[model samples]
Target: MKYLPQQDPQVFAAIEQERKRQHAKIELIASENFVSRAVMEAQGSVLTNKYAEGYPGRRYYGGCEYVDIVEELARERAKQLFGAEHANVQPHSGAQANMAVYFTVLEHGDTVLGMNLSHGGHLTHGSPVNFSGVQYNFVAYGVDPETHVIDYDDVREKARLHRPKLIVAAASAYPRIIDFAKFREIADEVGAYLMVDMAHIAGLVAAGLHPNPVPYAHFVTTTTHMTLRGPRGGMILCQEQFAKQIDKAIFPGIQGGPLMHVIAAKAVAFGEALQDDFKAYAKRVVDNAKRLASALQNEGFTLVSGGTDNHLLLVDLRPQQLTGKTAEKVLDEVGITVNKNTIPYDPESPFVTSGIRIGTAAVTTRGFGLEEMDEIAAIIGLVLKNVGSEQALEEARQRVAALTD
Candidate 1:
């Protein structure tokens, strides 16, 4: 038996329904993916019962020998995956990994330069609503509104002026490759440590589709799942020089016992990524994003930054006579799942933004190629083109089904 659950039949029914939704819908959320059966098995393994509260060799509990090997394998795999000198595979999520970096490198109220949240940057980078902003003196730089690209000149100017102690380079929604070397130079000029949040493009980085931050940045943090497609967790990569500080920061400074189960799954995923086929799959994901962007444009949607170099595309729905919220709702009813997000210099709130983000990572993993992208774009066009038209919505849903079938 596979440990069948005898309780909560109603809950099981709901979960099965959700699973069916996942299988049937076009999932374009850039930050999501479908892990292999191997990874799933590791995540649900007996390792979950063990509470290994310390590092591989150091533990609070007895009988940690097996978990030690599991976590060690994860650490080595993560290090090799990104070419890092050291790795900590324990941070609960990207945010916690980021927090550990902050605690290791910055004092309370120390200034840091990063991308602005409202302008396609992540909340961890420096949104005032986040802990990074609340505890640190955060400054931000954004893209050139006209070019819709990272204004490195502006980023440099801000770093020079602010003289922040840390310089973080990353994007949550901006659609171009970030120059980590440039960020490293800026950080060096200001004598600040550099941390690159490779959360969005960890897989791309691993695939060498994007530049590796490992050789340049002082510290690197990323979500294991995004394009990396591991279990939901975070990892910290650093030079051997900062090993002790990072370990202390992640363990006692932030989280308690590491999720050994997730670590095992991450190890499995990293091992998979080490294969040649995984690199090809990652490239396909980027190619699919470009195709999706082009299709959406042909269907009369404006893409943020005018394009994408990675997994996600930002569709400006305001010009299409649609608010992001309205578009998201209509698309969901038609079996497409995505999120509404703010574009740079947007007039609307984050919750009801001018843009909806779509990505090809999830669908691409599900074996969807360019043809499927065209159908998805067409469905999106129909749903938005005839918002609130139930007839049009159902018709598009049927069309979406026909594409996969």
Candidate 2:
């Protein structure tokens, strides 16, 4: 009765098709990675039937003893992974993790500062359409107009001018390393709480490939998936002094019951991250990204910031005189999966962006290395450079099939 094929053929067919698609295409979405099979096993376990309503050993419901062990393992592993004084692995997604942090520290309409969306900031940082921007008075800072790196001077100027209650350091599309110490100095000068949403770079941080914000920021929120390569959930880390408030904010203040199965999966993912092999995996991810960036440049594509220092890069498509929307469709026709993203100072609309975001995480997970990166870039160049030619499209499609096969 529980068999998906027998009980739900329609949904089962879609899931099967999606699975095949994942194996057949080049997955370059920056904020995505393939999780280990063990992680999936934990997420699909019996813990899903439990309703752990509160913290471990202090739940409001019965039959929580085993799930308590799972939650404790997740929290401890997360703390060790990030060097945080405390951790809460309960928020359902990155957005919810951010909501809990804001709830714990700010009042309604309190001023806050975050990066500009067009320049790499995440929507949760304060898009007017999101709850963060709708409830709080948010100001924005941009990157250097020429260098395309975060402008510390501009961030400080905005902090001083807005006098924000909180200063957020995060991004959804940035390609450079962030200076947490500098952000700490600005937050101190402005007397604002510092919260860094490290969702996109969690795995890099875990592998010590990126700067850890845990030491400088008062609160750090991240997703367990994405770069973390776990189930789709969220986590928050803070100092011991703010631990109770953060947990309370997530529980009674926001969510009702914790997803015990996903938490168990997070524990598994963190355990994997703590291994030596995971660091090697993370290094290859960055290496592949840089290699691909170079290959793309050689193919005549202009990348944002002129390059990348991380797992993802933005391809500024204007040099090719093509819209990201058009390039995205043509690339899809050739089996290369990428997303249209707005460049730092893009003139086009978000939907019709002038750039494309490419990452190497998921492909790296599939055991692709430098040579494969070169092939992918070559295929992308061929497809975009000859968008209107049916012969070229068919040839690119064959190359993609050969690569995936």
Candidate 3:
């Protein structure tokens, strides 16, 4: 970056602008976070100049000695952090990590019971457009319309009916703690492989703030960036029996070479998560989320699940007479960033949904606590409440600038 300002001013300016943007606004995106400088340094290290195509001590290329050590450190730290028998720190992103899991245990056109996308599931879980759904027959189970909570009985019913080869239990925008134990029971009852994509809550799980899926699921996958506060990468943890398959699936099965620099970054992040301070940070994340949820409710906004038990809350914008798209734009105008999401049984389309998902991970990373959460909730409520009034929006924008500045 030092030479880039002179060598490539365009890209350098864009990067500098993005840095300023991060400093000047509130980042409430549920799946985003700010990584530590240590993590950033590791991600931009000299390990990027390698071509280590395989696991440690079993490389497809020569001169991989240093990269092998880096990979080993990442794998070991990931295993320790999650209490898993084995860890694969290869797959480049969360989507690839999930694909590796499917490649390990499933065949083409196999039936898999997964969560529905509109009901808080990720695209890889069962969306037909994703490889997961196109390659496998995915039957979806979702939360109840009334409670907006996962209906375990309905999940059990789906398992009994489909008799799937795998059962996926995870979400992208859920607001409650997932019952991995209950999902394990359902997977066991149907003799299916259990996989939990703990991408969103990996940091919480690492801190024991939320239930660990490693103990219950056959395969647990996560992205390094979200709450883990690492470089963007993906990893899979599985029982020791499936270790070889998981590794092979990541290497020759799908991806060719791993990102050694990112793996090093993951190692640094896992190292950080092991610290007691990270545990305190994770606790504050949930605390801020709860306070934010309560503040939103007090503003007459309806939350999808009554309130949150985790880092993010899905707010139904219907009661406010606001579309998700409108809420997202106006909030962004006031320097509060959030994503519009589809609520369960949503009457609106995905593009113009009735919900906006908010989380405390990024702001909490920036040292924002419950007080800031309450203020953020108020800013969002104010902006949406006076959508058409430019004067009111400018006032809200000034308040946001004062807070961020």
Task: Provide the lowest-lDDT 10-residue window in model 2.
Answer: 1-10
Ranking by lDDT: 2, 3, 1
Ten residues in sequence with the least summed lDDT for candidate 3: 373-382
With a 3 Å backbone cut-off (N, CA, C), the pairs that clash in candidate 3 are none
Q: Which ranges in model 2 have alpha carbons more than 4 Å from their true place?
A: none
Superior by lDDT: candidate 1 or candidate 3: 3
Residue 21 of model 2: what lDDT? 95
Model 1 agreement with the true structure over 1-405: per-residue lDDT tens digits: 123335766777787887787888888777899899999899988888888887988888999999999899999988888999999999999999999999999999999999988777899988888999999999998889876788899889999999999999987787788889998998898888999999989999999998899999999999999999898999999999999999999878789888889999999999998999999999999999999899999999999888898888899887887788888888888778888988888899888898898878888888988888888888888889888688998899898787556
lDDT for each candidate structure = 0.89, 0.93, 0.92
Q: Which pairs of residues clash in candidate 1, taking residues 3 or more apart in a chain or in different chains? A: none
Which stretches of model 3 miss by more than 4 angstroms? none
- The TM-score that candidate 3 achieves is 0.99
* C-alpha lDDT of candidate 2 relative to the true structure: 0.93
> Compared to the true structure, candidate 1 yields what TM-score?
0.97
- The weakest ten consecutive residues by lDDT in model 1 span 1-10
Higher-scoring candidate on lDDT, 1 or 2: 2
Clashes of each: 0, 0, 0
Q: How many backbone clashes does candidate 3 have?
A: 0
